[PDB]
Each structure stands twice: as C-alpha cells, then as structure tokens.
Amino acid sequence: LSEGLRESLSSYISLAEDP
Amino acid sequence: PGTVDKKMVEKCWKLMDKVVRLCQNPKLALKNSPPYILDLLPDTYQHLRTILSRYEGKMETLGENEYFRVFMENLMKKTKQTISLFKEGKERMYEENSQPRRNLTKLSLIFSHMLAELKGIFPSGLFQGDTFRITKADAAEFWRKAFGEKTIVPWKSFRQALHEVHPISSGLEAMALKSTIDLTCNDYISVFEFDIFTRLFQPWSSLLRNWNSLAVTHPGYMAFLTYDEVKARLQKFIHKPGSYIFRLSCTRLGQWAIGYVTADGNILQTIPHNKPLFQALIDGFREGFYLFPDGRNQNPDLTGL
Ligand SMILES: [Ca+2]
C-alpha cells in the first residue's frame, strides 16, 4: 500500500537529478 | 563544491531577485499560505546578509565550511531550476494545478526547507553545526559513531551507515526513504534533516520499522500538506466521524499534525508533544477519535510498541 509517499516519490522522480 | 566567495553570493542574490520578479506576476495569484516563495527568498537573502555580516573580515573560514558550500551550490541549482521552470513553461504557468505550477509549489516547499535548515545550522548568522545536539540521544550516538562531528554527509554514505544499523530491504525503500529525509533535495543529508526525521519516526531502535508503518503503508500519511488542503480533503468525510489523516508542516518541522473530524462534525487538529506517532494513533483509536485513515473503514493495527 501507498498513499502520500506517492506524492513525494512522484515529486522526486519529476524534479530530482535521479535515479 | 568550490569555496564560496562574496561574488557567487551576489550572483545567487541576482538569481533570487529574478525568481522573485517572475513570481510577482499578477496573473499568478499568490496564495499567502505556506510555502510563500515571495517571503522565502527575501528572508533567505536577509539571513545570508546576517551570516556575511558576522563573518565579515574572516571570510576565509566561512568560505571553507562544507555545509555552506553545499548549501550555496544547492541554492544556485534550485533558483536556476525555478528560472528554467518559468522559461520552458510559458503559458502553462498561468493556470491551476498545472505541471509547472505544481512544480513551482514543490520547489517553494524546497526553498522553505532550505531556509529552515539555514536558520538551524546558522542561528543568528553564526555557525552552529559542528556543535550539534540532536534531540534524540540514540540517533545522535549513531551519527557520532558514523560521521563523527561532520555537519553534512553525502547520501550514499548515510545510506551505508544507516543500512549497517537499520537494514534496508530494497533500493526502492532507499529511494522512498531518500525522498522523505532529503528535504533540501540536494543528494546530501545534514544533521538538521537527520534530527527532523529521527524525531518524526521515533523511537530510534525501530526507526525504519516505524517509517514503514507510519509513512509507507499507513493510508493516513499525507506527507507535507497545507491546513487548507487537509480541510478540503477531510471535507469528503465531514459526515463520517473518526476519519483522520496526519501530515507534516513546513512551518513546524519535526512534528506531526493529525487532522480528524468530530461527531458534530467539525475538523480539528492535534500535535503530539514528543510522543511516538503510533502511540497517539493507538490512544486516539481506542477513544474513538482516529477510526478511519483517509476515510477508509479499516484502521492499521499499530500495536507494535
Ligand atoms: Ca539535504
């Protein structure tokens, strides 16, 4: 299950230098 | 990162001023509720002037500080990234819930985090990082053993030391953990961020265990949210007393904010004072206050004290 970690993970993937 | 001179500081000042101008556009409609970048960037600028004022003359020691270099580098990247957001996001910046708009909000949150961290490691403009006193003793002992008296450490090293003490199952878990603890989003972990995280998911003895049960799998977790967003989300269950969600506040780092509806029903908020989150959630559930995580009928049994 996931919830608001989805939001932070999505934000991370979209905005960080990654991976 | 290279040593910080007053020149680069002035360059960051120019970039911050540019971002401020880009955000001063009337068609943007600035919500005064945090994070408010039009207040963030000037406060950062003023605090930076305070640091320079106290380290005037002795700029040699200020430019050699590892955290100050990492911070200035990060500030450079983030401001430049925001300018790029406006540059490649032409018309879309003037909408609602748009991609570059939401990105701007997220970056604003980052600026808020960086300002808090800056005021934390440089209180009153004077450096206080090699003089750490982490709130949690166990976490402080871990940091003392792993990195000694260093103020900031690269993410890889932190992941190594943490895995030595608290085993990380997957790289996915490490990524989600990274998205949670790396507030400044600069691939670094400071004593400030470490203090925040370890206060958030206490006790230390079962840190990653609490994080898996309070953040990863608990449907009540909402990460960082505004009070208005909490209100608007719990509004769909204003007729279902006991429904609750908890969040993190960018104005109150290190503390949880539980929002719940009543039997009247009104929406109220509770902030635990140095209690483990699961303790307050269990107590609240046994008293009929925290019954439905995000409106869901089934509440997670967190009785793993
Ligand atoms: Ca960081």
One-letter amino acid of B235:
Q
**Angle of helix B155-165 versus helix B171-181 axis, rounded to 10:** 120
- What is residue B27's DSSP assignment? G
Which CATH number does the domain B6-125 belong to among 1.10.3260.10, 2.160.10.10, 1.20.930.20, 1.10.1490.10? 1.20.930.20
- Dist. CA B245–CA B236, nearest whole Å: 12
Is residue A18 less than 8 Å (CB to CB) from chain B?
A: no
Would you say the C-alpha torsion B28, B259, B119, B152 has a positive or negative sign?
Answer: negative
Would you say the C-alpha torsion B137, B143, B146, B149 has a positive or negative sign?
Answer: negative
The domain segmentation of chain B, as residue ranges, is: 6-125, 137-215, 218-293
CB pairs under 8 A between A and B: 50
Closest CB to A4: pick one of B103, B185, B222.
Answer: B222
Question: How was it solved?
Answer: X-ray
Class of domain B218-293: alpha beta
Listing DSSP states for B194-242 in one string gives HHHHHHHT--GGGHHHHHIIIIIS-TTEEEE--HHHHHHHHGGGTTSTT
Q: What is the Å distance from ligand 1's center to B227 Cα?
A: 25
- Give the CATH fold of the B137-215 domain: Recoverin; domain 1 (1.10.238)
Tokens of B33: 């509720």
Whole-Å CA distances, B255 to B104, B202, B246: 25, 11, 10
Vertex B119 angle, CA B117 and B125, to 5° = 135
Q: What is the Å distance from ligand 1's center to B182 Cα?
A: 4
- Dist. CA B25–CA B58, nearest whole Å: 39
Q: What is the resolution of this structure in A?
A: 2.5
Q: Are B94 and B19 a contacting pair, CB within 8 Å?
A: no
- Dist. CA B242–CA B282, nearest whole Å: 13
Partnered with residue B292 across adjacent β-strands are B243
